[PDB]
C-alpha cells in the first residue's frame, strides 16, 4: 500500500547484502 515511491527509492539505494 505504498502511497508513493520515494521511500522505496531510498530503501533500494541504501540496501546492501553483499559485503
Amino acid at each position, epitope marked *: *500500500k*505504498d502511497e508513493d515511491g520515494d*521511500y522505496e527509492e531510498l530503501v533500494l539505494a541504501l*540496501r*546492501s*547484502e553483499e*559485503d
Partner: antibody
Amino acid sequence: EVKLEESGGGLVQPGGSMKLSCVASRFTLSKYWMNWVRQSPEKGLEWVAQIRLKSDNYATHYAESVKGRFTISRDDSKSSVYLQMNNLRAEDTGIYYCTGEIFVNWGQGTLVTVSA
Amino acid sequence: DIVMTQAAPSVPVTPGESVSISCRSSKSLLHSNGNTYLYWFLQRPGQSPQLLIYRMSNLASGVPDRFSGSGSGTAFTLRISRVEAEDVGVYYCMQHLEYPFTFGAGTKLELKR
C-alpha cells in the same frame, strides 16, 4: 502516511510464551526487511531480530540474548510481521517496537512485562 | 559485537544556542562502498524513536535544517545549530554495519534557564 501497529504485549509468567504482532498500513510490507527493537530502562534500546524478503528466503538474524527463544516471521498477504517469544525471562521485560528496513517507521510499541 | 559509546549521559543547552553530541564505535563503520553505516535517532519523552540522520551525515526526510551529522570511521558527531524546544529528548546513535545492530546508551538534551 505509513503506520506500523504492534499488539500482543502484557503481563506474563517467567518461562511462559507470548506472540507479538505488527500490522502495516499504507506500507507495501512485502518489499521491505522488518525489524523488532525493544527498550528497557536497564539496557536502553536493543535490536532484537530482523527478517528479509521472500526472495532472500525470509532470511532471519537474531540478537544473541534472544537466539533459540524468539522467532521472527512475516505474512506479506496479511501485511504483518510477528515475534514468537518462548521461555520468557525477566530480562525480556520492556517496550517492543516493530520497525521497517531503514528505521524511519516505528510503531507505538507494546509493553511486555515478565513477572510471577 | 560493535560497542557504541556515548560518553555524555546528558547535555545542557541554552535555547537558541548550538550543541554537539558525540558517539564512538569500537570498530570502523566505514563500509567498502564508501558509506558509513551509522544512524542518529531522537526520542522525545513518551514517544517512539525518530530517525534524524542516516549514513552518518545525511538528513532524513522531514528533519529540520539545524541538524547535521559528521565524523570519521570511529568518531561521530551530531550537531544542532539552534536548539528549539522540540529538540529536547534523548539522542541515540546506532550502527548497522554488522549483526547485531547496536545502540549507544543515549544522550539526554536538556534546556538551560
